[PDB]
Amino acid sequence: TCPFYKKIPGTGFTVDAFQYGVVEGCTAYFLTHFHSDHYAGLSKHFTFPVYCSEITGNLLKNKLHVQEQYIHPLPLDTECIVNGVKVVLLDANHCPGAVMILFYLPNGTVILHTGDFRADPSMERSLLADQKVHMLYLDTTYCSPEYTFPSQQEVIRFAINTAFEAVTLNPHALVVCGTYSIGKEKVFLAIADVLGSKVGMSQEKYKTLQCLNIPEINSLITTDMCSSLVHLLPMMQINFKGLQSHLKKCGGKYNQILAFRPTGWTHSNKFTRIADVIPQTKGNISIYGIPYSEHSSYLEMKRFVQWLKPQKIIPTVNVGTWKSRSTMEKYFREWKLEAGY
Ligand code: NI
Numbered sequence: 303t304c305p306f307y308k309k310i311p312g313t314g315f316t317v318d319a320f321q322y323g324v325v326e327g328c329t330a331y332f333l334t335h336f337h338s339d340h341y342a343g344l345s346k347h348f349t350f351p352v353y354c355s356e357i358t359g360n361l362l363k364n365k366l367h368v369q370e371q372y373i374h375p376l377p378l379d380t381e382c383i384v385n386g387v388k389v390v391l392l393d394a395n396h397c398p399g400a401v402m403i404l405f406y407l408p409n410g411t412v413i414l415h416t417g418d419f420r421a422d423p424s425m426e427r428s429l430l431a432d433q434k435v436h437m438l439y440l441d442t443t444y445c446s447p448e449y450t451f452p453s454q455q456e457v458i459r460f461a462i463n464t465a466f467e468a469v470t471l472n473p474h475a476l477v478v479c480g481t482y483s484i485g486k487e488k489v490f491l492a493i494a495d496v497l498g499s500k501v502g503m504s505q506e507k508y509k510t511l512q513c514l515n516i517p518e519i520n521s522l523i524t525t526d527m528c529s530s531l532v533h534l535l536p537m538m539q540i541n542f543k544g545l546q547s548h549l550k551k552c553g554g555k556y557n558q559i560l561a562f563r564p565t566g567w568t569h570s571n572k573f574t575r576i577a578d579v580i581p582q583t584k585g586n587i588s589i590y591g592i593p594y595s596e597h598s599s600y601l602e603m604k605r606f607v608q609w610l611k612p613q614k615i616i617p618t619v620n621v622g623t624w625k626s627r628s629t630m631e632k633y634f635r636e637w638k639l640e641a642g643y
Contacts, residue, residue, distance in 0.1 A: 303322060304316060304319050304322040304325045305621075307439065307616050307617070307618055307621060308618075309325075310405055310413060310415070311407075311411075312407045312408065312409060312411065313385075313387055313405065313407065314327060314328055314329030314330060314385055315328065315329070315330050315331075315332060315384075315385075315387070315405070316328045316331055316332070317332045317334060317403065317415050317417070317439070318332070318333060318334055318340040318341075318417070319331060320333070320340075320341055320342060320343030320344045320348070321342040321343035322343070324350075328350070329351075329385050330350075330351050330353050330384055330385055331350055331351065331352050331353070332352075332353045332354065332403055332415075333352055333353070333354045333358055333362075334354075334394065334400060334401055334402070334403065334415070334417025334418065335355075335358060335394070335396055335397055335399055335400035335401070335417055335418060336357075336358050336361040336362070336365075336397070336399060336484055337397065337418065337483055337484070337485070338483065340417075340418070341362075341366070344362065344366055344368060345366060345367075345368070346366065346367035346368060346369065348368055348372060349372060350372065351372060351374055352368065352372055352373055352374060353374045353376060353384060353389075354373070354374070354375060354376070354399075354401070355375060355376065355378065355391060355399045355400075355401050356375045356377070356399070356515070357398050357399030357513065357514055357515055358375075358399040358400075358401075359373045359374075359375035360399075360513035360514070360515075361399070361484075361510070361513045364509065364513050365509070365510065365513070376389075376391050377391075378391050378392065378393060378401065379391075379392065379393075379428070379429060386408075387405060387406065387407065387408065388405075388406040389403060389404060389405055389406070390403070390404040390429055391403055391404075392404065392425075392428050392429065392430070393428075394416065394417050394418065394419040394420075395419055395420040395421070395422050395424075395425070395596075396417065396418045396419055396420060396485065396596045396597075397418075397483070397484045397485030397486075397596055398484055398485070398487070398514045398515075398516070399484075399514070400417060400418060400419070401417060402414060402415060402416045402417055402419060403415045403417070404429070404430075404435075411436050411437065412433055412434060412435050412436055412437075413435070413436065413437045413438075413439070414430070414435045414437075414438050414439070414610070414612070415439040415618075416438070416439065416440055416441045416618075417441065418441050418443075418596070418597060419441050419597070419598060420595065420596050420597055420598050420602065421598040421602040421603055421605065421606040422602070423605070425606065426606075426609050430610065435610055435611075435612050435613075436612065436613045436614065437612065437613065437614050437616065438607070438610065438612040438614070438615050438616070439616045439618050440603075440607070440615055440616065440617055440618060441597060441598065441618060441619055442603070442617040442618065442619045442620055442630055443566075443597040443598070443619045443620070444566075444567060444595075444597055444598060444599060444600055444603070445600065445603060445617070445619075445620065445629070445630050445633060446600060446629060446633070447600045447601075448572060448600075449567050449571075449599055449600045450571055450572070450599055450600065450601070451567055451571055451593040451595050451599055452576045452593065454488065454594060454595075456576050457576060457592055457593065457594045458488055458489070458492050458594075460576050460577070460579065460592065461489060461492065461493055461562060461590075461592060462492050462493060462496045464560070464590065465477050465493045465496060465497065465560060466496045466497065468558075468560045469497055469531070469560075472557075472558050474555075474556055474557045474558060475556065475557075475558040475559070475560055476531055476532075476533060476549070476552065476555075476556040476558070476559050476560070477493055477497070477531065477532045477533070477559075477560050477561070477562070478532075478533050478534075478535055478540070478545065478548065478559055478560075478561040478562070479493065479532065479533075479534055479535075479561070479562045479564070480534075480535060480536070480537040480539070480540035480561070480562065480563045480564065481507065481534050481535075481536070481537060482536060482537040482538075484510060484514070485596050486564045486594055486596065487511070487514075487516070488594075489562060489564050489592070489594055490532060490534060491522060493532055493562075494522065494530075494532040495522075497531060497532060499530055499531045499532050500521075500522060500523055500524040500526075500529065500530050500532075501522060501523050501524070501530060501532045501533075501534060502523075502524055502525070502526065502527040502528075502529070502530030502532065502533045502534070503523065503524075503525065503527075503533070503534040504525070504534075505525055507534055508523060508524075508525050511523055528555070533548070535548065537563065540561055540563045540589060541589070542584045542587055542589075545559050545561055545587050545589075546587065549586075549587075557586060558586045558587075559586065559587045559588070560581075560588050560590075561587070561588070561589045561590065562589075562590050562592055563589060563590070563591045563592070564592055564594040565591050565592070565593060565594075566593070566595055566597065567593060567595065568591060568593065570591070571593055576592075576593070579591075579592065604633075604637055607634075607637055608637055608640070608641045611641070611643040615634050617630050
């Protein structure tokens, strides 16, 4: 059965609620982004209207084979009417195609559902600036002050400088980047750009990337692995055994691997600056864990909420334990006392 925090009161609507079968009273299913915890349940046999971004809809049609007649793509930053209710989709600063959804209820209540997001001060100048929000359904993934990490720009600067140094020292080194889901594409695209290379990958990953409306993509990616010195591999193969095995396959073209694992936060963030990060090494293989996050840090989250001043907050992440829920409620009250709403 569908949990309450996936239902939008006063509507026929649900958000990211595809794994509960037919939800009683739901006339339109919204999907904020193409990540498996959120699309779980959708398949080619789904027969209700799905509302989403253009990019999400490309992935639903091409990767999940959802039939086209049930896919309803909406433009961003544009007032739209769905089953008689005004909605707006806003960029969530998450992965490609990810949105936040503003719902303007018939009774005058305004609800923001963030989906998954990385809060940014640029959101303070979207269509959110213009009106009051009564209820916020919030991505609370990193809702605790221990969760600190650098800007995406500092992390990319580290990666580009690390890769350019290694390959200039050793023209026979290969760079490998781990991937499992969409998101974080800037990691491998920025490295390939500094190296003057396309990025090489499997046909299935090329197919996924071709759904994302990235400008000039045909100039940046390829399935011809032999022509490329940046390769993408499944995240599970980013270890010494899997990388050794990959280097065999390259037919003596390369004699060294430098590999990157974009993670979320890890506890090494509570001790080390990005500048100071070092790899795990075995022989001619080195592996860097880099903290490239597509979710808000604690401080980013706090700033957004203190600016928006919602009347009520409903967390959508970390809701399964009483300890997590009590922790998050305590921070919500502090933020409200400190800012005065
Ligand atoms: Ni996500």
